[PDB]
Amino acid sequence: NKLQVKIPGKLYVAGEYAVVESGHTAILTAVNRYITLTLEDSERNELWIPHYENPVSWPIGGELKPDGEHWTFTAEAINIATTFLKSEGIELTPVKMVIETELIDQSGAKYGLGSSAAATVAVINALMTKFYPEISMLKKFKLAALSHLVVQGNGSCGDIASCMYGGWIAYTTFDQEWVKHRLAYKSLEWFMKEPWPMLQIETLEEPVPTFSVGWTGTPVSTGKLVSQIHAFKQEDSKNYQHFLTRNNEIMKQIIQAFHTKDEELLYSSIKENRRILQELGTKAGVNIETSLLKELADSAENMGGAGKSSGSGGGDCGIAFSKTKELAEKLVNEWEKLGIKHLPFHTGRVQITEG
Amino acid sequence: NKLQVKIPGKLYVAGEYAVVESGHTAILTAVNRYITLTLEDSERNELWIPHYENPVSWPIGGELKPDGEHWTFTAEAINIATTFLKSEGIELTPVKMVIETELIDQSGAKYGLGSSAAATVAVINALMTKFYPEISMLKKFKLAALSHLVVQGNGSCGDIASCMYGGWIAYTTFDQEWVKHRLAYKSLEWFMKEPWPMLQIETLEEPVPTFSVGWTGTPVSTGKLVSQIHAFKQEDSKNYQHFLTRNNEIMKQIIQAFHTKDEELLYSSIKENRRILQELGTKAGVNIETSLLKELADSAENMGGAGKSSGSGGGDCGIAFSKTKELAEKLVNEWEKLGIKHLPFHTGRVQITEG
Amino acid sequence: NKLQVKIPGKLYVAGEYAVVESGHTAILTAVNRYITLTLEDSERNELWIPHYENPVSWPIGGELKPDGEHWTFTAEAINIATTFLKSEGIELTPVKMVIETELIDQSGAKYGLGSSAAATVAVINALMTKFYPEISMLKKFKLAALSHLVVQGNGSCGDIASCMYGGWIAYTTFDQEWVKHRLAYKSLEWFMKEPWPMLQIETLEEPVPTFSVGWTGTPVSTGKLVSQIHAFKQEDSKNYQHFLTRNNEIMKQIIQAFHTKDEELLYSSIKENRRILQELGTKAGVNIETSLLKELADSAENMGGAGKSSGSGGGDCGIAFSKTKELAEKLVNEWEKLGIKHLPFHTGRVQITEG
Amino acid sequence: NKLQVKIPGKLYVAGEYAVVESGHTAILTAVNRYITLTLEDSERNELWIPHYENPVSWPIGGELKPDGEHWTFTAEAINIATTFLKSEGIELTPVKMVIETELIDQSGAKYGLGSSAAATVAVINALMTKFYPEISMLKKFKLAALSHLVVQGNGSCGDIASCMYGGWIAYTTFDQEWVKHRLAYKSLEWFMKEPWPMLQIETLEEPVPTFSVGWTGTPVSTGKLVSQIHAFKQEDSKNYQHFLTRNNEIMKQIIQAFHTKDEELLYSSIKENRRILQELGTKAGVNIETSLLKELADSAENMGGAGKSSGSGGGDCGIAFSKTKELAEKLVNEWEKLGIKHLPFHTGRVQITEG
């Protein structure tokens, strides 16, 4: 008799990079690949993660601070959840948590489905369900976002949102500077009840066109690729602000496409977003879209649909929308020939069970 | 009856860039140019800063959240102090605080004497003196460091340390990730009582060799230097690590030179630090030393002493040590001929008076 | 041994019209043309102004309420100064005040350099220097603002601020309704000690580019224009709001230009401001930028710089920024050919001397 | 025991627009539709108004400054009454005040019966009856007038007079400029004791001819019309002055008609007033007499009497005088087929009961 929490991985569909800016919108979809965290009562606290053969323990109602390096994201989530529960007068009791992941390739490389985010979301969902089940989903997102943002040091938290809500969403980044400044003088409970400036999470309906995901398995040194854009920003304000401005225009369209179920407006919008991204990388000396990615995208358009890299780029998953199942069928093999590894898609859903 | 708090500006003497890393060391000296904050009781809260003729006000014991970016550093300090004081059950009463500065050039450009740190330290000192004067200096450093680091978004806080302690100090950066992670689940009071891993603030004796300061006829352009370097450590970790390794050994030598009054060791050590910084810049493809800074340093060495840029480089101040006052005078004369603006130096000291 | 007070005129640089709105920001510069008020002890009070041959007198410590229409601004100033002094237990003694002006053309026509504001400021400074010199600058601005406000019946008081502080300033209008509502139930002393919301007066650094002033004007009415625009605000809210939205975006740009010494940003910003003022006039059916004003501005833009009307427009002065003293000289040359009177410029400054 | 105050609504009968000018006169009648303010002692201050579902509170003897825009008129009346009571050495005690209205249609639209003036007068009467009942009606008018004019920002306060005095009155506007100028330097106590120049409120005898009130069902955004007329005054002083001069001739006549009960002189005066307002509307490009108001007045005239818009015109109510009740009923029937809502009328009277 235990508690199982399944958190779907995530994929950026549109709006990448621009979304790092406060108040900017991106489109994301959760995927049918999960992080499974099983929680059960125990004699002492215990945490097991896919990167360590042995678990770590820590005092009841106390702090978890192991010497590892891959414990950071999950430990921070535990620490924040603990501090919050105590502030709410909720007493913690020893539990054992075990985390499994389907976000890693047989080789050991991450597909790029937001592992750090899903793991964070799993812990928050597990602990809240166990000790504060009636807490709103929005507050759980906030706890998870705070956790992930302090550990990552950056990021829009759009990934946290996708994993937390599952399905398809339009995510608008909250005012991060606003939050960071307040972390030093405001309490968690304050953060839970105070509305976050610019934040918005909108559930969208799964598009009719068939969605396909191809893993270009090129381990992305995110620290570089993304940072190169970071430096680019504060260097070519014109070209960057141009990107942002354009991105907002295109995002307004893709959203309408979702709202009106306009398949052609969807294809056209994805193509436009794919271009401004190539442009961004171009006039920035960056390779967001690698060769394999370029082909994945080209083969998606030639097949009648549309495609583009999913995320920061320079490797990892790419996405495409096809007019028909058959067209998707052809494209899949079309990719498999190019070396791209297809990843059977099914909109991810958060699954919490007490079986 | 008023409270006057005079906080000296600061100058990095050695260890720049490396000090950004946790557990790394730098040498700093406070200067005899101050930020003067005068606090007095009033009907409403009032905060006045240098170029704004109208102060801002905020609720007693409430949050101060002005729009202007010019209020950010001081507002954060007030907010962190308020939250802390309240945690100690201290009741806040309306105060009027006026801030004056001597850290700016006639035109209005900052000399690069740590304006944001000095202002932060001034606020923390004034408020602590007024509502909790028995608080240790270390605890005040901690409050100031937290405030400055969340606002700056980076920085070793060596400037905060120099402004807070005055005189000459050897500063070793606290574990910044340790602090950032805990900002989300630990309390301000906890931070106050907890020892900060790696933190070291060692007071040093006033050096015997004559210390000179020269402003390189122009403000920086920071946006690039710090940025470009930050991006460099990611890309070329080998040379960056060599830099870090060399830096800490040189810092040990400088500290010994001070302790043992070994002038020759001081000059040779400063020359070495200048050199590892030039190597760093070159391999990063940037110029920490502008033409004028190079002349400032080169002349200082030619005069029988040593010199180097102070801080980020690319402008602002350069410093030097000379064997005698006479040689220091000749050095200064040369600088002026070259276009360097001499800034008469005297070690700065924190001064708190309640007259 | 009498007291002489010289108050500089003012010129709106950017943000006109929109500045009437509470919390909106405009740029202004005082001019090297002054209003001179000379005060001295006498047997009976005497006020001499450039518009009347004979002076007016009133009871010591009493109110000045003359029939003349052109005594209003100065009389109101004397009356509010008197009420203030009385609240301070200060006793008034007879004095003779004579006002002289360099703000009128050799045709008795006002250049449009804020005559009502300068006079108001002159009176406040004269009486305060003579009877209560310890008063802060801000309080003097408040007295002057309230005085001008009720007499003019409208206005942002950005002119008062400029004549009071001189130099270059970014003026942010106080909460208009907050002040007006309180005039009915709060005392003058209350207004003096209370923090005014939204108000702000920021001291700026004179721009590097050469500033030129041309009197492409001729008394038109002014009231006609200010009333028309006010009416437009009601009749066409969408377009008026568009103007405000653009004005605020542009204003933040110009403030950035001033702060960063960015000349290019300055030129582009002024051109933008000019355009929205043209649009406003067109949509409202008002002639802000007259034909001659249009020429003044066009010539300035053709010369590689930027130009625009200053203030209400419909005549009065126009202003411009040239890339070099030479270009400016040529510009001034073209204006003179077009029938525009040049007014050599030097940043105005308040001069209060007793010998 | 609760205190109930009923303030009647108002309707301008003649002299509208011109009445804003100092010393000019208008005729008004209060109507049998009321604003009801119920006051009682409570533990804390409480104000409830129709627009909001919840009340606002404020410190005993302190200032009421809520955030909602619709609280302004009543909050101002409370603030000025409070300042007046303190000047008389009266101690404020906590009270609960609830305002209800009959000045609105079933649909929720205001009839245009002076909602803001009536509310202001209800507050002043309620607080004076409760804390300083001996005060004169003229002093109460002054408190209500000062309150309403700084909030409205314009207007003659003839509406305030009618709501305060009830019945039929000849209202002569006080010296507007005289009041506004002194707001900056005179105390409220001085205003109460000083006779206001030009002010006159004369109680009149109700005319024998039946008075009919018809609501056009068109709410009016007064601002737009008033601002347009004020601008017209600046854009064409000759025509505007013709309007005023003409208006003054008519007012003299209508006052004679009232004094002597000259029914024929009343009809012709109304027709003439209607005419000059039509002229003003035409010349200024302001739709004072709408198509519905035209039909309303025409039918009144065709029936043997006279009619016209009441107040700003542009909508709201139209009024008429008829030879007999029978002719009035015929007139009303004609109005109703046009969509005009008949508002059964009989002179309104202030009703204050402490039982």
PDB file of all heavy atoms in Angstrom, chain A residues 63 72 76 79 83 181-185 188 234-235, chain B residues 63 76 79-80 83 181-185 224 227:
ATOM      1  N   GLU A  63      16.480  18.961   7.762  1.00  0.00           N
ATOM      2  CA  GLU A  63      17.077  19.287   6.472  1.00  0.00           C
ATOM      3  C   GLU A  63      17.812  18.147   5.781  1.00  0.00           C
ATOM      4  O   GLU A  63      18.502  17.351   6.419  1.00  0.00           O
ATOM      5  CB  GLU A  63      18.041  20.474   6.630  1.00  0.00           C
ATOM      6  CG  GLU A  63      18.972  20.688   5.445  1.00  0.00           C
ATOM      7  CD  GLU A  63      19.934  21.843   5.652  1.00  0.00           C
ATOM      8  OE1 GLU A  63      20.441  22.004   6.782  1.00  0.00           O
ATOM      9  OE2 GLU A  63      20.191  22.582   4.678  1.00  0.00           O
ATOM     10  N   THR A  72      20.834  17.580  -5.616  1.00  0.00           N
ATOM     11  CA  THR A  72      20.436  18.980  -5.532  1.00  0.00           C
ATOM     12  C   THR A  72      18.987  19.316  -5.869  1.00  0.00           C
ATOM     13  O   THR A  72      18.255  19.809  -5.013  1.00  0.00           O
ATOM     14  CB  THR A  72      21.374  19.855  -6.382  1.00  0.00           C
ATOM     15  OG1 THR A  72      22.735  19.534  -6.060  1.00  0.00           O
ATOM     16  CG2 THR A  72      21.138  21.326  -6.083  1.00  0.00           C
ATOM     17  N   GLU A  76      16.398  20.084  -2.798  1.00  0.00           N
ATOM     18  CA  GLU A  76      15.879  21.444  -2.649  1.00  0.00           C
ATOM     19  C   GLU A  76      14.351  21.379  -2.559  1.00  0.00           C
ATOM     20  O   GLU A  76      13.744  22.037  -1.719  1.00  0.00           O
ATOM     21  CB  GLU A  76      16.293  22.312  -3.847  1.00  0.00           C
ATOM     22  CG  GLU A  76      15.863  23.790  -3.755  1.00  0.00           C
ATOM     23  CD  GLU A  76      16.671  24.623  -2.749  1.00  0.00           C
ATOM     24  OE1 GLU A  76      17.694  24.134  -2.222  1.00  0.00           O
ATOM     25  OE2 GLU A  76      16.287  25.786  -2.495  1.00  0.00           O
ATOM     26  N   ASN A  79      13.445  20.156   0.807  1.00  0.00           N
ATOM     27  CA  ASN A  79      13.688  21.196   1.795  1.00  0.00           C
ATOM     28  C   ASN A  79      12.639  22.299   1.757  1.00  0.00           C
ATOM     29  O   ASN A  79      12.159  22.735   2.804  1.00  0.00           O
ATOM     30  CB  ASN A  79      15.096  21.772   1.604  1.00  0.00           C
ATOM     31  CG  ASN A  79      16.181  20.770   1.976  1.00  0.00           C
ATOM     32  OD1 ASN A  79      17.278  20.770   1.403  1.00  0.00           O
ATOM     33  ND2 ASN A  79      15.880  19.911   2.949  1.00  0.00           N
ATOM     34  N   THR A  83       9.886  23.078   4.790  1.00  0.00           N
ATOM     35  CA  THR A  83       9.745  24.398   5.389  1.00  0.00           C
ATOM     36  C   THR A  83       8.318  24.929   5.245  1.00  0.00           C
ATOM     37  O   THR A  83       7.791  25.562   6.154  1.00  0.00           O
ATOM     38  CB  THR A  83      10.721  25.404   4.740  1.00  0.00           C
ATOM     39  OG1 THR A  83      12.069  25.024   5.046  1.00  0.00           O
ATOM     40  CG2 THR A  83      10.466  26.799   5.257  1.00  0.00           C
ATOM     41  N   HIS A 181      14.072  38.891  -5.815  1.00  0.00           N
ATOM     42  CA  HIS A 181      14.276  39.921  -4.801  1.00  0.00           C
ATOM     43  C   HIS A 181      13.519  39.593  -3.517  1.00  0.00           C
ATOM     44  O   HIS A 181      14.020  39.814  -2.423  1.00  0.00           O
ATOM     45  CB  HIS A 181      13.793  41.280  -5.302  1.00  0.00           C
ATOM     46  CG  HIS A 181      14.625  41.851  -6.405  1.00  0.00           C
ATOM     47  ND1 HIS A 181      14.257  42.983  -7.101  1.00  0.00           N
ATOM     48  CD2 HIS A 181      15.819  41.465  -6.914  1.00  0.00           C
ATOM     49  CE1 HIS A 181      15.193  43.271  -7.988  1.00  0.00           C
ATOM     50  NE2 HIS A 181      16.150  42.368  -7.894  1.00  0.00           N
ATOM     51  N   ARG A 182      12.308  39.071  -3.659  1.00  0.00           N
ATOM     52  CA  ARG A 182      11.488  38.750  -2.498  1.00  0.00           C
ATOM     53  C   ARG A 182      11.872  37.489  -1.756  1.00  0.00           C
ATOM     54  O   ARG A 182      11.435  37.287  -0.630  1.00  0.00           O
ATOM     55  CB  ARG A 182      10.013  38.687  -2.896  1.00  0.00           C
ATOM     56  CG  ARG A 182       9.397  40.059  -3.080  1.00  0.00           C
ATOM     57  CD  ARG A 182       8.728  40.181  -4.435  1.00  0.00           C
ATOM     58  NE  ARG A 182       8.743  41.566  -4.895  1.00  0.00           N
ATOM     59  CZ  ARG A 182       7.989  42.514  -4.362  1.00  0.00           C
ATOM     60  NH1 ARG A 182       7.170  42.203  -3.370  1.00  0.00           N
ATOM     61  NH2 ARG A 182       8.071  43.766  -4.797  1.00  0.00           N
ATOM     62  N   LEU A 183      12.689  36.641  -2.370  1.00  0.00           N
ATOM     63  CA  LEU A 183      13.107  35.414  -1.707  1.00  0.00           C
ATOM     64  C   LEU A 183      13.883  35.740  -0.439  1.00  0.00           C
ATOM     65  O   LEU A 183      13.933  34.936   0.489  1.00  0.00           O
ATOM     66  CB  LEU A 183      13.986  34.567  -2.629  1.00  0.00           C
ATOM     67  CG  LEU A 183      13.277  33.588  -3.564  1.00  0.00           C
ATOM     68  CD1 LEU A 183      14.285  32.986  -4.535  1.00  0.00           C
ATOM     69  CD2 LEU A 183      12.595  32.490  -2.742  1.00  0.00           C
ATOM     70  N   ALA A 184      14.480  36.927  -0.401  1.00  0.00           N
ATOM     71  CA  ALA A 184      15.270  37.347   0.748  1.00  0.00           C
ATOM     72  C   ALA A 184      14.461  37.942   1.908  1.00  0.00           C
ATOM     73  O   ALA A 184      14.944  37.976   3.039  1.00  0.00           O
ATOM     74  CB  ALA A 184      16.324  38.345   0.307  1.00  0.00           C
ATOM     75  N   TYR A 185      13.244  38.416   1.644  1.00  0.00           N
ATOM     76  CA  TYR A 185      12.462  39.014   2.720  1.00  0.00           C
ATOM     77  C   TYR A 185      10.991  38.632   2.812  1.00  0.00           C
ATOM     78  O   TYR A 185      10.284  39.150   3.670  1.00  0.00           O
ATOM     79  CB  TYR A 185      12.601  40.544   2.678  1.00  0.00           C
ATOM     80  CG  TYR A 185      11.978  41.237   1.480  1.00  0.00           C
ATOM     81  CD1 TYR A 185      10.673  41.732   1.531  1.00  0.00           C
ATOM     82  CD2 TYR A 185      12.711  41.444   0.306  1.00  0.00           C
ATOM     83  CE1 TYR A 185      10.112  42.424   0.446  1.00  0.00           C
ATOM     84  CE2 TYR A 185      12.157  42.135  -0.786  1.00  0.00           C
ATOM     85  CZ  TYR A 185      10.861  42.623  -0.703  1.00  0.00           C
ATOM     86  OH  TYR A 185      10.335  43.337  -1.761  1.00  0.00           O
ATOM     87  N   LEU A 188       7.438  31.763   2.282  1.00  0.00           N
ATOM     88  CA  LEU A 188       6.842  30.848   1.320  1.00  0.00           C
ATOM     89  C   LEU A 188       5.328  31.014   1.297  1.00  0.00           C
ATOM     90  O   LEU A 188       4.721  31.067   0.225  1.00  0.00           O
ATOM     91  CB  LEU A 188       7.163  29.394   1.677  1.00  0.00           C
ATOM     92  CG  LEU A 188       8.547  28.834   1.359  1.00  0.00           C
ATOM     93  CD1 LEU A 188       8.811  28.979  -0.134  1.00  0.00           C
ATOM     94  CD2 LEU A 188       9.597  29.566   2.172  1.00  0.00           C
ATOM     95  N   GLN A 234      22.650  40.864 -24.323  1.00  0.00           N
ATOM     96  CA  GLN A 234      23.323  42.080 -23.887  1.00  0.00           C
ATOM     97  C   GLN A 234      24.530  42.346 -24.783  1.00  0.00           C
ATOM     98  O   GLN A 234      25.674  42.358 -24.325  1.00  0.00           O
ATOM     99  CB  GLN A 234      23.765  41.924 -22.433  1.00  0.00           C
ATOM    100  CG  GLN A 234      24.541  40.643 -22.169  1.00  0.00           C
ATOM    101  CD  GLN A 234      24.618  40.296 -20.697  1.00  0.00           C
ATOM    102  OE1 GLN A 234      25.159  39.257 -20.321  1.00  0.00           O
ATOM    103  NE2 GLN A 234      24.074  41.166 -19.853  1.00  0.00           N
ATOM    104  N   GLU A 235      24.261  42.556 -26.066  1.00  0.00           N
ATOM    105  CA  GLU A 235      25.303  42.814 -27.046  1.00  0.00           C
ATOM    106  C   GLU A 235      24.662  43.393 -28.301  1.00  0.00           C
ATOM    107  O   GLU A 235      25.109  44.411 -28.831  1.00  0.00           O
ATOM    108  CB  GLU A 235      26.032  41.509 -27.387  1.00  0.00           C
ATOM    109  CG  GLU A 235      27.130  41.649 -28.428  1.00  0.00           C
ATOM    110  CD  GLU A 235      28.291  42.498 -27.946  1.00  0.00           C
ATOM    111  OE1 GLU A 235      28.073  43.690 -27.639  1.00  0.00           O
ATOM    112  OE2 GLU A 235      29.423  41.972 -27.876  1.00  0.00           O
TER     113      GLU A 235
ATOM    114  N   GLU B  63       6.400  47.179   3.311  1.00  0.00           N
ATOM    115  CA  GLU B  63       7.356  46.969   2.237  1.00  0.00           C
ATOM    116  C   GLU B  63       7.574  48.248   1.433  1.00  0.00           C
ATOM    117  O   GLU B  63       6.642  49.032   1.221  1.00  0.00           O
ATOM    118  CB  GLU B  63       6.855  45.855   1.305  1.00  0.00           C
ATOM    119  CG  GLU B  63       7.610  45.745  -0.011  1.00  0.00           C
ATOM    120  CD  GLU B  63       7.035  44.679  -0.938  1.00  0.00           C
ATOM    121  OE1 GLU B  63       5.798  44.500  -0.950  1.00  0.00           O
ATOM    122  OE2 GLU B  63       7.816  44.033  -1.668  1.00  0.00           O
ATOM    123  N   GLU B  76      15.869  47.053  -1.293  1.00  0.00           N
ATOM    124  CA  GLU B  76      16.044  45.660  -0.884  1.00  0.00           C
ATOM    125  C   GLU B  76      16.630  45.592   0.527  1.00  0.00           C
ATOM    126  O   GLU B  76      16.237  44.752   1.335  1.00  0.00           O
ATOM    127  CB  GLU B  76      16.978  44.928  -1.853  1.00  0.00           C
ATOM    128  CG  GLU B  76      17.195  43.439  -1.549  1.00  0.00           C
ATOM    129  CD  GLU B  76      16.024  42.557  -1.965  1.00  0.00           C
ATOM    130  OE1 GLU B  76      15.190  43.013  -2.766  1.00  0.00           O
ATOM    131  OE2 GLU B  76      15.942  41.402  -1.505  1.00  0.00           O
ATOM    132  N   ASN B  79      13.964  46.415   3.015  1.00  0.00           N
ATOM    133  CA  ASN B  79      13.033  45.299   3.099  1.00  0.00           C
ATOM    134  C   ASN B  79      13.604  44.121   3.885  1.00  0.00           C
ATOM    135  O   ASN B  79      12.903  43.522   4.706  1.00  0.00           O
ATOM    136  CB  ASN B  79      12.607  44.865   1.689  1.00  0.00           C
ATOM    137  CG  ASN B  79      11.660  45.870   1.035  1.00  0.00           C
ATOM    138  OD1 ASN B  79      11.535  45.930  -0.194  1.00  0.00           O
ATOM    139  ND2 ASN B  79      10.982  46.656   1.861  1.00  0.00           N
ATOM    140  N   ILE B  80      14.871  43.788   3.646  1.00  0.00           N
ATOM    141  CA  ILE B  80      15.494  42.687   4.375  1.00  0.00           C
ATOM    142  C   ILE B  80      15.677  43.037   5.858  1.00  0.00           C
ATOM    143  O   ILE B  80      15.511  42.184   6.733  1.00  0.00           O
ATOM    144  CB  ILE B  80      16.869  42.311   3.764  1.00  0.00           C
ATOM    145  CG1 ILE B  80      16.651  41.552   2.448  1.00  0.00           C
ATOM    146  CG2 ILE B  80      17.664  41.445   4.731  1.00  0.00           C
ATOM    147  CD1 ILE B  80      17.935  41.164   1.731  1.00  0.00           C
ATOM    148  N   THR B  83      12.112  42.916   7.570  1.00  0.00           N
ATOM    149  CA  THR B  83      11.727  41.533   7.815  1.00  0.00           C
ATOM    150  C   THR B  83      12.523  40.952   8.982  1.00  0.00           C
ATOM    151  O   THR B  83      11.964  40.275   9.844  1.00  0.00           O
ATOM    152  CB  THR B  83      11.951  40.661   6.562  1.00  0.00           C
ATOM    153  OG1 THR B  83      10.966  40.990   5.573  1.00  0.00           O
ATOM    154  CG2 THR B  83      11.860  39.179   6.905  1.00  0.00           C
ATOM    155  N   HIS B 181      20.657  28.360  -2.393  1.00  0.00           N
ATOM    156  CA  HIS B 181      19.722  27.256  -2.236  1.00  0.00           C
ATOM    157  C   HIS B 181      18.887  27.467  -0.974  1.00  0.00           C
ATOM    158  O   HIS B 181      17.676  27.291  -0.989  1.00  0.00           O
ATOM    159  CB  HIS B 181      20.481  25.929  -2.157  1.00  0.00           C
ATOM    160  CG  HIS B 181      21.123  25.527  -3.451  1.00  0.00           C
ATOM    161  ND1 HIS B 181      22.034  24.498  -3.543  1.00  0.00           N
ATOM    162  CD2 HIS B 181      20.970  26.007  -4.708  1.00  0.00           C
ATOM    163  CE1 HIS B 181      22.412  24.358  -4.801  1.00  0.00           C
ATOM    164  NE2 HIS B 181      21.782  25.263  -5.528  1.00  0.00           N
ATOM    165  N   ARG B 182      19.539  27.875   0.109  1.00  0.00           N
ATOM    166  CA  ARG B 182      18.854  28.084   1.377  1.00  0.00           C
ATOM    167  C   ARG B 182      18.003  29.333   1.470  1.00  0.00           C
ATOM    168  O   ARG B 182      17.170  29.457   2.366  1.00  0.00           O
ATOM    169  CB  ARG B 182      19.871  28.041   2.514  1.00  0.00           C
ATOM    170  CG  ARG B 182      20.398  26.635   2.717  1.00  0.00           C
ATOM    171  CD  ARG B 182      21.628  26.556   3.609  1.00  0.00           C
ATOM    172  NE  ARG B 182      22.033  25.158   3.718  1.00  0.00           N
ATOM    173  CZ  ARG B 182      22.480  24.432   2.700  1.00  0.00           C
ATOM    174  NH1 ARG B 182      22.604  24.971   1.491  1.00  0.00           N
ATOM    175  NH2 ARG B 182      22.749  23.145   2.876  1.00  0.00           N
ATOM    176  N   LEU B 183      18.194  30.268   0.551  1.00  0.00           N
ATOM    177  CA  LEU B 183      17.382  31.475   0.585  1.00  0.00           C
ATOM    178  C   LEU B 183      15.911  31.098   0.453  1.00  0.00           C
ATOM    179  O   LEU B 183      15.038  31.822   0.922  1.00  0.00           O
ATOM    180  CB  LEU B 183      17.772  32.429  -0.547  1.00  0.00           C
ATOM    181  CG  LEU B 183      18.826  33.475  -0.179  1.00  0.00           C
ATOM    182  CD1 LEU B 183      19.053  34.419  -1.353  1.00  0.00           C
ATOM    183  CD2 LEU B 183      18.352  34.269   1.027  1.00  0.00           C
ATOM    184  N   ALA B 184      15.648  29.950  -0.173  1.00  0.00           N
ATOM    185  CA  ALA B 184      14.283  29.483  -0.383  1.00  0.00           C
ATOM    186  C   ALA B 184      13.640  28.732   0.784  1.00  0.00           C
ATOM    187  O   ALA B 184      12.418  28.658   0.860  1.00  0.00           O
ATOM    188  CB  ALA B 184      14.220  28.612  -1.641  1.00  0.00           C
ATOM    189  N   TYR B 185      14.436  28.165   1.688  1.00  0.00           N
ATOM    190  CA  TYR B 185      13.843  27.424   2.799  1.00  0.00           C
ATOM    191  C   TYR B 185      14.380  27.723   4.196  1.00  0.00           C
ATOM    192  O   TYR B 185      13.886  27.179   5.182  1.00  0.00           O
ATOM    193  CB  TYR B 185      13.914  25.918   2.516  1.00  0.00           C
ATOM    194  CG  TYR B 185      15.303  25.322   2.446  1.00  0.00           C
ATOM    195  CD1 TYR B 185      15.900  24.764   3.579  1.00  0.00           C
ATOM    196  CD2 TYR B 185      16.004  25.265   1.235  1.00  0.00           C
ATOM    197  CE1 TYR B 185      17.153  24.153   3.510  1.00  0.00           C
ATOM    198  CE2 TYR B 185      17.259  24.663   1.158  1.00  0.00           C
ATOM    199  CZ  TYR B 185      17.825  24.105   2.301  1.00  0.00           C
ATOM    200  OH  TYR B 185      19.055  23.488   2.234  1.00  0.00           O
ATOM    201  N   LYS B 224      30.119  43.955 -21.216  1.00  0.00           N
ATOM    202  CA  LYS B 224      30.893  43.014 -22.008  1.00  0.00           C
ATOM    203  C   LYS B 224      31.966  42.263 -21.222  1.00  0.00           C
ATOM    204  O   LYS B 224      31.967  41.036 -21.203  1.00  0.00           O
ATOM    205  CB  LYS B 224      31.515  43.743 -23.200  1.00  0.00           C
ATOM    206  CG  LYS B 224      30.473  44.332 -24.136  1.00  0.00           C
ATOM    207  CD  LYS B 224      31.088  45.243 -25.185  1.00  0.00           C
ATOM    208  CE  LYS B 224      30.005  45.887 -26.045  1.00  0.00           C
ATOM    209  NZ  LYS B 224      30.557  46.888 -27.002  1.00  0.00           N
ATOM    210  N   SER B 227      30.667  39.843 -18.614  1.00  0.00           N
ATOM    211  CA  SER B 227      29.893  38.893 -19.403  1.00  0.00           C
ATOM    212  C   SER B 227      30.796  37.951 -20.200  1.00  0.00           C
ATOM    213  O   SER B 227      30.669  36.732 -20.110  1.00  0.00           O
ATOM    214  CB  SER B 227      28.958  39.647 -20.357  1.00  0.00           C
ATOM    215  OG  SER B 227      28.244  38.751 -21.193  1.00  0.00           O
TER     216      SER B 227
END
